[PDB]
Amino acid sequence: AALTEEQIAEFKEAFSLFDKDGDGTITTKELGTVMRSLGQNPTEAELQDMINEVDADGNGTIDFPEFLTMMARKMKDTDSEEEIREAFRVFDKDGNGYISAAELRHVMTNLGEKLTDEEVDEMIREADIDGDGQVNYEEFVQMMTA
Amino acid sequence: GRKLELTKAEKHVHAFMMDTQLTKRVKNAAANVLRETWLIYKNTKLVKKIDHAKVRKHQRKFLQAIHQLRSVKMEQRKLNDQANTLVDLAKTQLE
Ligand SMILES: Cc1cc2c(cc1Br)NC(=O)/C2=N\O
Ligand SMILES: [Ca+2]
Ligand SMILES: [Ca+2]
């Protein structure tokens, strides 16, 4: 657990994503707002647990010191290839490892936040490696995570 | 930068037993797993004649304790991924 001086200043900006009113401390109410804006639905007890796991002095909120000290233990990352491949698999109707360019355009222009037809053109240009109108999403994901 | 990488999950459940409610739940359910495992074993292997009504009672209490422990473990995994969500959000500022 070592943080560079550069990581410390960047995590100060990060603290403001949570400390919504800027009074220097993260409360359960603020974490609920943050978590719901990320599309999750923690219960009150779950929010209290998140606070309590980091709140070193037991005053009920998280200050930047406690915030920063716990980030120091959580810096290890790992690749997302398999999880991304599983998101593509949601749209593999026949479970054959393929999604047609036509079906990918349909998905991307109708579900989620969506892409424009121009943006989907660029994505398919990269995703349809063999030029056969079909996306082998395992290979596409392996290219993007290489 | 980090590109598509995300915070690595801890390989084994090991967190949030500060909750007290989760800690009490684990202690009581685990003790009941021990209790009902013994009482099922005694009543199926250490008696002259099996009392099946007794066996059904302790099988009911056994499955409830086992599934209570499963419920705690799933709640620990949920809490751990909620916490990793917050870590991942903070790490977007490293870019
Ligand atoms: C950024 C952040 C991380 C965490 C937390 C609260 C905040 Br904010 N509570 C936690 O247990 C945790 N990581 O394990
Ligand atoms: Ca605040
Ligand atoms: Ca505190």
Residue numbers in the entry:
A (entry chain R): 2 to 147
B (entry chain B): 395 to 489
Sentences from the paper on this structure:
In the proximal carboxyl-terminus of the channels, there is a region called calmodulin binding domain (CaMBD). The Ca2+ binding protein calmodulin (CaM) that is constitutively associated at the CaMBD serves as the Ca2+ sensor of SK channels. In response to physiological signals, elevated intracellular Ca2+ levels enable Ca2+ binding to CaM, inducing conformational changes in the channel carboxyl- terminus and subsequently opening the channel pore.
This was done utilizing four compounds,1-EBIO, NS309, SKS-11 (6-bromo-5-methyl-1H-indole-2,3-dione-3-oxime) and SKS-14 (7-fluoro-3-(hydroxyimino)indolin-2-one), varying up to 1000-fold in potency. NS309, SKS-11, SKS-14 and 1-EBIO all primarily form contacts with L480 of the CaMBD and with M51, M71 and K75 of CaM. Similar to 1-EBIO and NS309, both SKS-11 and SKS-14 dose-dependently potentiated SK2 channel activity at 0.1 μM Ca2+. The EC50 values of NS309, SKS-11, SKS-14 and 1-EBIO for potentiating SK2 current are 0.552 ± 0.083 μM (n = 8), 3.87 ± 0.88 μM (n = 8), 33.2 ± 4.8 μM (n = 9) and 286 ± 31 μM (n = 6) respectively. The total Eint is −43.5 kcal/mol for NS309, −38.8 kcal/mol for SKS-11, −32.6 kcal/mol for SKS-14 and −29.5 kcal/mol for 1-EBIO. On the other hand, the electrostatic Eint is −12.3 kcal/mol for NS309, −7.9 kcal/mol for SKS-11, −7.5 kcal/mol for SKS-14 and −1.8 kcal/mol for 1-EBIO. For instance, the distance and angles (θ) from the main chain oxygen of M51 to the nitrogen in the five-member heterocyclic ring is 2.8 angstrom (θ = 134.7°) for NS309, 2.9 angstrom (θ = 164.2°) for SKS-11, 3.1 angstrom (θ = 129.7°) for SKS-14 and 4.1 angstrom (θ = 120.6°) for 1-EBIO. The distance from the main chain oxygen of A477 to the nitrogen in the “ = N-OH” group is 3.6 angstrom (θ = 129.9°) for NS309, 4.0 angstrom (θ = 105.2°) for SKS-11 and 4.9 angstrom (θ = 92.8°) for SKS-14.
